[PDB]
Amino acid sequence: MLSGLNHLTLAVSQLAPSVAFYQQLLGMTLHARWDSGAYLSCGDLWLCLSLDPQRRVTPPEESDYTHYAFSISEADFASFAARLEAAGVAVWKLNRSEGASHYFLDPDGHKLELHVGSLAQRLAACREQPYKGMVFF
Amino acid sequence: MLSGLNHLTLAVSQLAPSVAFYQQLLGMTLHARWDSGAYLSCGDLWLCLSLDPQRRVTPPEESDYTHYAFSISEADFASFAARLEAAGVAVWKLNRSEGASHYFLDPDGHKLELHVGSLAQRLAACREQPYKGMVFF
Ligand SMILES: O=C(NCCc1cccs1)c1ccncc1
Numbered sequence: 493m494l495s496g497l498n499h500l501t502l503a504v505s506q507l508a509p510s511v512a513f514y515q516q517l518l519g520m521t522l523h524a525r526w527d528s529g530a531y532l533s534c535g536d537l538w539l540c541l542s543l544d545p546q547r548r549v550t551p552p553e554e555s556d557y558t559h560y561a562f563s564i565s566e567a568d569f570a571s572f573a574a575r576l577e578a579a580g581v582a583v584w585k586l587n588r589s590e591g592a593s594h595y596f597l598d599p600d601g602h603k604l605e606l607h608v609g610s611l612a613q614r615l616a617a618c619r620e621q622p623y624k625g626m627v628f629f
Numbered sequence: 630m631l632s633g634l635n636h637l638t639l640a641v642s643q644l645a646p647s648v649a650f651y652q653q654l655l656g657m658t659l660h661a662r663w664d665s666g667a668y669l670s671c672g673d674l675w676l677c678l679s680l681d682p683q684r685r686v687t688p689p690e691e692s693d694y695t696h697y698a699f700s701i702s703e704a705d706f707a708s709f710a711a712r713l714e715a716a717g718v719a720v721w722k723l724n725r726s727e728g729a730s731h732y733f734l735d736p737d738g739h740k741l742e743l744h745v746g747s748l749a750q751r752l753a754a755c756r757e758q759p760y761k762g763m764v765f766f
C-alpha cells in the first residue's frame with residue numbers, strides 16, 4: 493500500500509543555478525550536495541535535484557501541463573509572488589480556478605505553482621459547481 | 630514561506646486508462662473524475678490527472694530523469710513491485726542507486742518509483758556510502 497509522495501526528483505541542466513533557485517530564491521533547506529545532485533526539503537517534501545545532460549531548457553509552450561504546486565498561506569502568497577517577479581521569474585499561466593495560484597517556471601522550464609488550498613477545499617467548491625461530466629466517489 | 634507539495638499534476642493522454650492505473654493498479658483513492666481530469670489521493674498527496682492533448686506517450690530513453698517516488702513500507706515493497714511486474718508494467722531503471730527502489734512507468738511514460746525510507750534515512754545511508762563528492766550541511 494502506498495502511503496504518500498516519497499520524493500520529487502527534478503532533472504536539471506546546471507546544478508548551481510538550480511540550487512540557487514530552490515534554496516535561495518524559494519527558501520528550501522539544502523541538506524546535501526554531490527557532484528551530480530542535491531537534496532533539499534520543503535516542509536514534508538523531499539526534493540532531489542539531479543544533474544542530467546539530457547535535461548533541455550524547455551519553453552512552456554513545448555511541455556505539457558505536468559506541474560508541481562507548493563503550499564503557501566494566503567497571508568504569504570502576494571509577497572512571495574512579488575519576490576519571484578522581482579527576480580524576473582517567468583509566469584506560464586494566469587489563475588482562473590479556486591484558491592490563489594501563481595504559475596512560474598524554474599531555470600530549466602519545470603512548471604511550478606504556488607497554491608493556497610487543500611484537496612478538501614477544491615472538492616467542496618466542485619460539489620457546489622461541478623465541472624463538466626463530474627462524478628464524485 | 631513554502632511548506633511542502635500542495636499537489637502533483639500529471640498530464641495524461643487518455644484519462645480512463647490513467648485513472649485505472651493510479652486507482653486500480655496502484656491503489657490510490659479516487660475522489661472525483663470529470664471529462665478532463667481526476668483527483669486522487671495517496672496518503673497526504675493530492676494527485677491530479679489532467680487530460681492534455683499535448684501529452685505524448687514517451688519512452689524512457691526520450692525523457693530526462695525527472696521522476697515521482699511513492700512511499701511504501703519495507704514489509705510491502707517486494708510484493709507490490711512483483712505485482713507490477715506480473716501486470717506487465719514497463720520499467721525504466723534497474724540499478725538501486727538511492728536505496729530500496731523499484732522504477733516503473735505509467736501509461737504515458739511518466740517515471741515513477743516505489744521507495745522505502747525517508748530523507749533522514751537516505752542521508753544516514755549516504756554518510757556510509759556517499760555519492761561522489763557528497764557534502765552534508
Ligand atoms: O494500468 C494497468 N496496467 C499497466 C499498464 C502499463 C503498461 C506500461 C506502463 S503502465 C491496468 C490497470 C487496470 N486494470 C488493468 C491493467
Ligand SMILES: O=C(NCCc1cccs1)c1ccncc1
Nearest residue numbers: 493649652653654655656712716
Ligand atoms: O493486487 C492488487 N492490486 C492490483 C490488481 C490489478 C491488476 C491489474 C490491474 S489492477 C491489490 C491487492 C490487495 N490490495 C490492494 C491491491
Ligand SMILES: [Mn+2]
Nearest residue numbers: 559561605638
Ligand atoms: Mn495546479
Ligand SMILES: [Mn+2]
Nearest residue numbers: 501698727742
Ligand atoms: Mn528516486
